[PDB]
Write a protein that binds this ligand. Structure first.
Ligand SMILES: [Mg+2]
Ligand SMILES: [Zn+2]
Ligand SMILES: [Zn+2]
Ligand SMILES: [Zn+2]
Ligand SMILES: [Zn+2]
Lengths: 98, 602, 223, 56, 76, 49, 243, 65, 388, 98, 49
């Protein structure tokens, strides 16, 4: 067929110029991370999450007054935790406990 | 749009207005030759016929340029474009030149190829300091590389592993005499950053010059006569007087070196090879009290580490990197401040070819046995590495049972790491002293290290001994798994062998934890080359563009563009830093001794 | 064979844009299409040559040695220039409306005439002097010549302007400022107030900052 | 009254441009020489006509 | 008890006289505004008799000339 | 119009292809291509008709 | 033509010396690549020197020496197989120079090193440009050899000529090899004039003068710098001066 | 890429003594004695018999002008 | 031959030579005693005047360009050094290339201040009296006199822990434990092992807000003067130096025992407010000199004294880029090609502004010879011009 | 001993595919290997048998390639000793005329 | 090859190092020089995905 057997293969021939995908290294989807301490504020915990496309940072930070920020993707404006955590699915303070 | 057309790191102040693309240039690779003078350059013969100067025939080159236009643009003395006084250029290529080689009508302007003598420039492109553009003096040789004399390669900061240098001819007759008078190589032999010489000797020129002035360098009659013809100089039949006829009528090594110096030098200084300061002292003591002794009797108590020249005759010494060199050499230094400049371009042109002759026909190989230590010296090393690891294992036990002995500044975790590295350092320095003491100064691997030409005394004892510890920006190696760097070590361990410390040479083989520890320390060196270069480039643009306005007026005053006086009597008046000596001024001390000697000696 | 001595900057008057320009462009069309690139508008309506056709504004002028020429657009609505907008805001909140004064006492008129010639050399020292004039004119609401005619509070961030005016007793409605309302106010400032700011009465009129006529760049700058 | 290095490189530059545009040469002849090198030889014998102005 | 002087960093200042202003001005052919302007703050000038609009001479030392003068002005 | 030159076409055959093993050098052509008019009526710059 | 080892000793062919002038050895050996001795105990490349003996042992014995990492052929077994095949234990041999011919009083090291040629060859680097095709918009040269263009002279190269003192050369390089244009400019308006051929007479639009008008000689990139400031509402009043 | 008909340092022909060499090394005989049995004396002749590829078989079969 | 003969031969000759030169030349001639007599004395002075006359700067030089290149070349070869220095006192003072940027750009903050403290003539040799000076300089709060916090049950709310040796090895004076009541709020009094148990026995004003007292007296304790960082003592030149941390000048100089006249500092903006501008001239000069010598490679101090005497040009020190000397007074076109911001800056001088000439970036922009270098000389020549 | 949990295979395969071309790579320095493993990716050499019937934009071919002498045992079992790249010179170490 | 998505120019001193998990998966030596110098890295010769 006009080849040599030592060629390993693994490359497309789109348009007549042999093109290869080079593997991009992710940062472990659907995990959770415990970020380090004492660069400007207290400890934070950043994460990534994507399904069918769009990926976004969803962090739960806290600085030295007990704000406990939560980050939203769209329209950033960092929101307090007990604003979001009450408004999401739980109303009773006993339910936040459990 | 307009704001992106005006600006944007390549807009129309820096990209196209104050920096433009040019004409009449070339760019190729470089390759050495130490046979041309210090201020010449090779030009390939293809590039020489595609760059042209304008010539404007007056009255006394009219016989020359009749021949340059009769010859066509093929044979190397030739022309390309002739110009009438109207302005209509006439290309020469097509089918006849005899009808253009008629009455040539004084006033025309002919463009001919470069010849031996036309001033060019040169460039390296990263253009850091003031001196990386320097007008050379074209010489034409057939191949495809720019050639370049070996001593002129610390200004350009180049080497010869396929780099790229670009020349560009200047054309108009006012812009050409500025290049020849103000920018030639010999005006730039000393540097304005520290005064010391910059264009000087390199790798072979130093370690060849040590083999000429060793005690025991006796050349025969044929070897003297051959090398004086090869190093340029022209002397008649006076190599005299055949100093040791015991075997055969053969000379010494000092008197072949004492033909290059002018006739009334007087210098005495101490250099790097001094291993016994007492036998220099004695020589010095006689000199200071009895200013002019006799060169025969007392002076044959000499050493090989005290240079002493009088009346252009080196009685006692040994030439190393204190007489040339990219850093301070005070024998090229005292020859540019006393005997013009044009003398010191032919001192450095005759030294260079004399020194490479003797290093060629005497051999300077370096095989594998030069790094070798005998058995009893190796067991001296291994008892050092054993007890130094045991001292580390004891100091961990003091921290583990609560016998902290703390330092005031650091915390207990940080005191432990502090103390350990000092022990490890000392261990590697103590074993470096063992090897240095043993192997003699007679192999061709310490000759390159004592004098100094691409060597240290670190990497010849980092090749038959330890390699020390292996750190990364001051910390000891800690990145890895949860409490263990590699997965071959029991966790919870702070021992020397288990946290980045190699113990084998580059001859006795690295085992795979030590080799993998060495790649960690090696990648830290390669990142900091490409990072640090980009920060210095932007930091230079601030300082040039803030300070490029300042001149020096005739009454000695540095002034801004608004007329506000910035500094009276330039630079704490008033001596040029290119010609001051080591911060100071007129140098009375050397002057007194020099003038007295000449007068008294006569 | 002269040389340039000095370059003096300023602002183009809209009167001078018409006299400099050779044509008005009214045809929103470039080529239409793939043949005969000639219009009565943006291409060579005696405006500039890029082709090998000798038709120019009566001056021959083939593409070698042809300076391009400027066109103009009679904009139907007044238009704020972008670069001045931070500094138009410095003018509007520091002037007494409907008359044209400066909201200062007679002491500072006679003092700051005299302070100009004392600091008449250095650039950095007179640049701080023009900020404090903006400071003192802000915190006043009573002018000596109009009896405090209900000064509104100006606004910015980024480009759209407003005012905080009261109508019945204390309302805080955000009346949007019109660009036609601004340029009518700027013409009422007399020329004597321009030395009190950093302006010049022959080279930089403030009412010329609002683009009533937009000039068109030449053909030789648009290949 | 010794010249500096900036004035010596301008006097040569102006004299090499006159020597190409006419301006008959002194005894400088032999056999072929570029007009810049004619200005160096005339400057060696100290017969330059051009003098400097010293602003003070 | 100490002052700003008697220190290895601060060179000593002194305020000139009326006849010395024109004598300094004709040697250097300058105008009075073309001099580098101490502010009326910064305690070196305040313990002397600082008047704005005056020339003040300093006597600083350099290790490569000896002693070296450097004239300045006073602006508020 | 747009002739590159002459005596650069000494290596082409009739149809426009270089017959192999010929010392092509410099700016010698490889395939002789004719293009079609390309807007006979766009400019009419006094001689293009 | 750049050669290199696989240890990292890159370099360029110095010259091309004939076979007759070669320092040769007390056998039929005439070396090819005479490497500089000042680079081995400065760059710490001891693997060069083990491989150079390992070529001489494995060429006389017959079998290609295994040389893999960490489990390969050891150091001491080579220098004994060389010592029993007829040569000195460290490579060193007696060598005669080819120009004059006498034993060099040292014992010159010699081996077999596998080099490899690289494609930074000189015929893909060398180019010269006298005067080529330029940009349409600026009349400046192009970029790349595939579009026939030269070098570019940044802001570094302007400052390395002011450090010398060159003011004549700095003009001649940057503008004479560029666009120069002659422009008619009015006097009392400061704005540019407008010529009009077929009817001679030149006139400044702004205030309509007839003869009081002059000529200013300036670059074209400065003339385009005026127009990008002229499109924006800035007026560049020129107030020219005699020489 | 057929064997070079000279050496590269020592001018001496070798291509006549390669196909006789290789047919006697695929019987198990040691090459240290085979190259000595022929006329190969130095080790500049011998580094270019003992390391070669003779890859002419693969390229030839493809058949294209 | 004697003193008078030389001194008055140098005094007469003096006028072309310099003042520094005079002292130097005399003190060596007199010193040398194998002595030369009369005629060679005149030969030495008439040779010394020729080298001074040879080594003056040529008028027209381009000082400002060769200052910026010879200070910006060694920053590319500005590699790492021995971060494992074998000292104790000086610790983590940001060695290297980021120091050179921090001294050129003004930057009010600068990281790692280390102020050198010298001792006077009565606290010079005394070992233990040097310790009590370090007591007075250091200063400690209550939060760093602990190691962690364990909560109590009801009202004690806090506890102090390991270790107590910060008051028995340095001597931070247990009499100050009694002193704690100074202007405080509640101030309970219970000292068993010398540490004060602080109860807060009240109500609705204080309910559970422990955190607001953590910024008051619990943190407001100042057990010693000059409320700044840590102190280390080194032996240098038979005097003890106290290389402390931080920078609190006008408080530190008013301490009984520090020699006030010699304490140099690693901060820039504070030495201008306290010691004056011309002291901050020498702060910039002496600091770049100490960085170059640590890396082996030398730069001449004519280039440093051109930058430092240009960065203090208007009585307050300026930065070098985009807010300082380039952004300060020049031609208005000179500010166009630097600080790519230009619609901020080029449209600012669109209003009422002229621009003459006489930069270096302008004459290159328009096609004129620049003023530096060879475009500074002016020729003149008459015209019979006979060949002869 | 009776303490371990696994056992390595051959450890001469830590490094990559163009870093297993350098013979004795445990004796050299570390930055010299990085240049050495960056030039096995650039040498000339006969790589494939189908260089004749192929249209690639620029190719190279070296007339007499040679299988190296002393090398790793990995490069026999990847194929490099069947399509090799480079020749075997015979060097000497001495300083010639400059 | 195994590349890593970051910025090529700004320094990442903690993302251009050589970590203990790279043993036997990523080659310690192969890294092209330039501004990258440790953002493109090659798989080892004994690994599996
Ligand atoms: Mg290079
Ligand atoms: Zn026109
Ligand atoms: Zn009013
Ligand atoms: Zn007019
Ligand atoms: Zn051979």
């Amino acid at each position: 067929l006009g080849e040599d057997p030592k060629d390993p293969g693994g490359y497309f021939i789109i348009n007549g110029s042999e093109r290869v995908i080079v593997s991009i290294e992710d940062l472990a989807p659907n995990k959770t991370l415990v970020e380090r301490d004492e660069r400007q504020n207290k400890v934070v915990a950043k994460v990534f999450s994507y399904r069918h496309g769009y990926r976004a940072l969803i962090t739960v930070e806290r600085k030295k007054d007990g704000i406990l920020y939560v980050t939203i993707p769209n329209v950033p404006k960092p929101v307090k935790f007990v604003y979001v955590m009450r408004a999401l699915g739980l109303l009773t303070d006993k339910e936040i406990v459990e | 749009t307009l704001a992106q057309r005006l600006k944007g790191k390549e807009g129309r102040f820096r990209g196209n207005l104050s920096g433009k693309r040019v004409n009449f240039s070339a760019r190729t690779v470089i390759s050495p030759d130490p046979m041309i003078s210090i201020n010449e350059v090779g030009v390939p013969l293809a590039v020489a016929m595609e760059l042209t100067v304008p010539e404007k025939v007056t009255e006394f080159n009219y016989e020359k340029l009749k021949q340059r236009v009769l010859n066509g643009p093929e044979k190397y003395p030739g022309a390309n474009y002739v110009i009438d006084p109207e302005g209509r250029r006439i290309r020469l290529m097509e089918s006849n030149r005899e009808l253009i080689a008629e009455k040539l009508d004084i006033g025309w302007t002919v463009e001919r190829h470069l010849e031996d003598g036309d001033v060019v420039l040169f460039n390296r492109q990263p253009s850091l300091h003031r001196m990386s553009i320097m007008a050379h003096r074209v010489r034409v040789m057939p191949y495809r590389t720019f050639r370049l004399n070996l001593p002129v390669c610390p200004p350009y900061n180049a080497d010869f592993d396929g780099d790229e240098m670009n020349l560009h001819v200047p054309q108009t007759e006012e812009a050409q005499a500025e290049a020849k008078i103000l920018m030639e190589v010999q005006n730039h032999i000393i540097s304005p950053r520290y005064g010391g010489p910059l264009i000087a000797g390199i790798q072979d020129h130093i370690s060849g010059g040590y083999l000429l002035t060793r005690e025991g360098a006796y050349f025969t009659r044929y070897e003297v006569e051959q090398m004086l013809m090869f190093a340029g100089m022209d002397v008649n039949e006076l190599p005299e007087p055949d100093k040791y006829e015991n075997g055969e009528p053969l000379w010494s090594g000092k008197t072949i070196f004492s033909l290059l110096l002018p006739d009334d030098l007087t210098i005495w200084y101490r250099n790097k090879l001094c291993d016994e300061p007492e036998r220099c002292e004695a020589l010095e003591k006689l000199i200071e009290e009895k200013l002019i002794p006799d060169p025969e009797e007392v002076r044959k108590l000499a050493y090989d580490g005290f240079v002493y020249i009088q009346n252009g005759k080196l009685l006692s010494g040994a030439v190393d990197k204190k007489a040339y060199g990219r850093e301070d050499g005070k024998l090229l230094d005292i020859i540019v401040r006393e005997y013009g400049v044009e003398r010191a371009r032919q001192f450095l042109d005759q030294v260079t070819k004399l020194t490479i002759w003797v290093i060629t026909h005497k051999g300077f190989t370096t095989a594998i046995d030069d790094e070798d230590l005998p058995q009893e010296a190796i067991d001296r090393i291994h008892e050092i590495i054993r007890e130094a690891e045991e001292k580390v294992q004891r100091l961990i036990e003091a921290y583990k049972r609560g016998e902290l002995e703390p330092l005031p500044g650091k915390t207990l975790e940080e005191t432990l790491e502090s103390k350990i590295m000092a022990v490890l350092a000392e261990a590697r320095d103590n074993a470096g002293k063992v090897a240095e003491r043993y192997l003699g100064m007679n192999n061709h691997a310490v000759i390159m290290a004592k004098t100094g030409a691409r060597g240290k005394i670190l990497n010849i004892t980092q090749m038959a001994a330890m390699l020390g510890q292996q750190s990364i920006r001051g910390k000891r190696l800690y990145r890895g798994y949860r409490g263990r760097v590699l997965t071959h070590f029991k966790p919870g361990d702070l021992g020397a062998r288990a946290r980045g410390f190699v113990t084998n040479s580059y001859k006795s083989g690295l085992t795979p934890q030590e080799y993998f520890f060495h790649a960690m320390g090696g990648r830290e060196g390669l990142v900091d080359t490409a990072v640090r270069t980009a920060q210095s480039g932007y930091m230079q643009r601030r300082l040039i563009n803030a300070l490029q306005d300042l001149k020096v007026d005739y009454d000695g005053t540095v002034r801004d563009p608004t007329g506000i006086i910035v500094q009276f009597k330039y630079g704490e008046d008033g001596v040029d830093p290119m010609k001051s000596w080591q911060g100071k001024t007129v140098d009375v001390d050397r002057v007194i001794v020099r003038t007295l000697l000449k007068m008294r000696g006569g | 064979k002269k040389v340039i001595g000095s370059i003096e900057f300023g602002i183009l008057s809209p009167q001078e844009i018409r006299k400099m320009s050779a044509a008005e462009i009214t045809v929103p069309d470039t080529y239409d299409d793939d043949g005969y690139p000639i219009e009565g508008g943006l291409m060579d309506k005696r405006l500039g040559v890029i082709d090998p056709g000798l038709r120019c504004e009566t001056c021959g002028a083939r593409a070698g040695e042809c300076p391009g020429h400027f066109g103009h657009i009679e904009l139907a609505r007044p238009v704020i220039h972008v670069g001045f907008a931070k500094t138009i805001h410095r003018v509007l909140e520091s002037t007494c409306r409907e008359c044209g004064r400066i909201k200062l006492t007679d002491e500072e008129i006679e003092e700051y005439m005299q302070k100009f010639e004392v600091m008449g050399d250095r650039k950095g020292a007179v640049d701080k002097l023009i900020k404090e004039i903006h400071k003192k004119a802000k915190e006043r609401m009573v002018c000596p010549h109009c009896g405090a005619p209900q000064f509104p509070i100006k606004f910015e961030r980024p480009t759209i302007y407003w005012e905080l005016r009261k109508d019945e007793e204390g309302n805080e409605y955000k009346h949007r400022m019109m660009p036609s309302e601004v340029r009518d106010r700027l013409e009422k400032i007399p020329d004597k107030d321009l030395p009190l700011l950093g302006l010049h009465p022959e080279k930089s009129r403030p009412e010329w900052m609002v683009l009533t006529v937009l000039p068109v760049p030449p053909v030789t700058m648009r290949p | 009254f010794r010249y500096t290095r900036f004035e010596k490189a301008r006097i040569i530059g102006a004299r090499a441009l006159q020597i190409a545009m006419g301006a008959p040469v002194l005894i400088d002849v032999p056999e072929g020489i570029t007009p810049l090198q004619a200005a160096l030889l005339e400057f060696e014998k100290g017969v330059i006509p051009i003098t400097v102005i010293r602003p003070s | 008890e100490f002052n700003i002087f008697d220190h290895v960093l601060v060179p000593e200042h002194r305020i000139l006289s009326e006849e010395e202003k024109e004598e300094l001005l004709k040697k250097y052919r300058i105008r009075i505004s073309q001099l580098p302007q101490i502010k009326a703050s910064d305690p070196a000038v305040v313990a002397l008799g600082a008047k704005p609009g005056d020339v003040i001479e300093i006597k600083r030392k350099s290790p490569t000339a000896g002693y070296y003068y450097y004239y300045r002005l006073v602006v508020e | 119009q747009g002739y590159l030159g002459e005596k650069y076409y000494r290596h082409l055959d009739e149809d426009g292809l270089i017959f192999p093993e010929s010392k092509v050098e410099g700016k010698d052509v490889l395939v002789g291509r004719t293009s079609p008019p390309r807007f006979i009526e766009e400019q009419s710059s006094l001689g293009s008709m | 033509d750049k050669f290199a080892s696989r240890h990292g000793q890159k370099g360029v062919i110095g010259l091309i010396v004939p076979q007759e002038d070669m320092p040769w050895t007390e056998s039929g050996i005439v070396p090819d690549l005479i490497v500089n001795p000042h680079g081995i105990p400065s760059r710490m490349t001891v693997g060069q020197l083990i491989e150079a003996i390992g070529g001489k042992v494995a060429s006389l014995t017959g079998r290609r020496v295994d040389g893999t990492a960490f489990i390969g052929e050891p150091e001491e077994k080579l220098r004994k197989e060389l010592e029993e095949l007829g040569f000195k234990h460290s490579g060193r041999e007696i060598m005669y120079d080819g120009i004059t011919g006498r034993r060099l009083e040292a014992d010159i090291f010699i081996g077999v090193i596998y080099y490899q040629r690289l494609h930074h060859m000189v015929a893909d680097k060398m180019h010269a440009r006298s005067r080529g095709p330029v940009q349409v918009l600026t009349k400046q040269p192009t970029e790349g050899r595939a579009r026939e263009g030269g070098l570019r002279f940044g802001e570094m190269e302007r400052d390395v000529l002011i450090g010398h003192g060159a003011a004549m050369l700095l003009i001649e390089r940057l503008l004479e090899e560029s666009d120069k244009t002659e422009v008619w400019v009015c006097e009392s308006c400061g704005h540019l004039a407008l010529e009009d051929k077929r009817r001679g007479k030149v006139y400044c639009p702004v205030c309509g003068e007839d003869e009081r008008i002059s000529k200013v000689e300036m670059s074209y990139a400065f003339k385009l710098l005026l127009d990008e400031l002229k499109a924006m509402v800035i007026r560049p009043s020129l107030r020219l001066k005699d020489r | 890429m057929i064997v070079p008909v000279r050496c590269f340092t020592c001018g001496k022909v070798l291509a006549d003594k390669y196909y006789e060499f290789k047919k006697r090394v695929e019987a198990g005989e040691d090459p240290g004695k085979v190259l000595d049995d022929l006329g190969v004396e130095r080790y500049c002749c011998r580094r270019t018999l003992l390391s070669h590829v003779e890859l002419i078989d693969q390229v030839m079969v493809y058949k294209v002008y | 031959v004697a003193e008078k003969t030389i001194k008055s031969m140098v005094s007469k000759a003096e006028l072309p030579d310099n003042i520094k030169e005079e002292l130097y030349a005399k003190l060596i001639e007199y010193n040398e005693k194998y002595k030369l007599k009369k005629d060679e004395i005149q030969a030495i002075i008439d040779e010394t005047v020729r080298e001074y006359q040879k080594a003056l700067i040529e008028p027209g030089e381009a000082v400002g360009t060769v200052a910026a290149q010879s200070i910006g070349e060694p920053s590319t070869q500005m590699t790492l050094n021995t971060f494992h220095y074998a000292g104790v006192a000086e610790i983590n003072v940001t060695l290297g290339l980021p120091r050179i940027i921090e001294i050129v750009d003004a930057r009010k903050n600068p990281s790692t201040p280390i102020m050198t403290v010298y001792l006077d003539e009565e606290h010079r040799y005394d070992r233990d009296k040097a310790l009590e000076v370090a007591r007075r300089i250091e200063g400690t709060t209550l939060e760093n006199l602990a190691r962690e916090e364990t909560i109590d049950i009801l009202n004690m709310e806090y506890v102090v822990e390991i270790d107590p040796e910060r008051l028995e090895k340095a001597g931070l004076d247990m009499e100050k434990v009694v002193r704690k009541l100074t202007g405080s709020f509640k101030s309970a009094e219970f000292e068993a092992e010398g540490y004060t148990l602080v109860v807060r026995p009240k109500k609705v004003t204080k309910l559970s807000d422990l955190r607001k007292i953590a910024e008051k007296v619990k943190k407001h304790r100042l057990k010693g003067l000059s409320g700044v960082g840590k102190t280390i003592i080194r032996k240098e030149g038979d005097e003890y130096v106290i290389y402390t941390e931080g920078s609190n000048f006008k408080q530190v100089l008013k301490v009984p025992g520090v020699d006030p006249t010699r304490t140099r500092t690693n901060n820039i903006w504070e030495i201008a407010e306290v010691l004056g501008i011309e002291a901050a001239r020498n702060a910039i000069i002496d600091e770049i000199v100490s960085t170059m010598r640590e890396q082996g490679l030398e730069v001449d101090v004519r280039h440093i004294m051109l930058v430092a005497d240009m960065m203090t040009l208007d009585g307050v020190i300026r930065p070098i880029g985009r807010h300082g000397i380039v952004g300060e007074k020049a031609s208005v076109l000179a500010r166009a090609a630097f600080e790519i911001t230009t619609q901020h800056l080029f449209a600012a001088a669109e209003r009422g502004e002229v621009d003459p000439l006489n930069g270096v970036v302008e004459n290159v922009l328009i096609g004129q010879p620049v003023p530096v270098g060879t475009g500074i000389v002016k020729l003149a020549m008459s015209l019979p011009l006979r060949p002869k | 001993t009776e303490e371990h949990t696994h056992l390595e295979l051959m450890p001469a395969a830590i490094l990559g595919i163009p870093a297993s071309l350098v013979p004795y790579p445990e004796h050299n320095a570390a930055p010299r290997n990085t240049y050495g493993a960056g030039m096995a990716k650039q040498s000339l050499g006969l790589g494939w048998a189908n260089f004749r019937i192929r249209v690639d934009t620029r190719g190279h071919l070296m007339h007499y390639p040679q299988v190296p002498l002393v090398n790793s045992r990995i490069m026999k079992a990847v194929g490099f000793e069947d399509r090799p790249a480079g020749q075997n010179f015979v060097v000497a170490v001495l300083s010639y005329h400059g | 090859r195994v590349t890593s998505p970051l910025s090529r120019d700004q320094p990442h001193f903690e993302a251009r190092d050589l970590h203990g998990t790279h043993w036997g998966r990523i080659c310690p030596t192969e890294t092209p020089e330039g501004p990258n110098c440790g953002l493109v890295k090659n798989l080892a010769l004994m690994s599996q995905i």
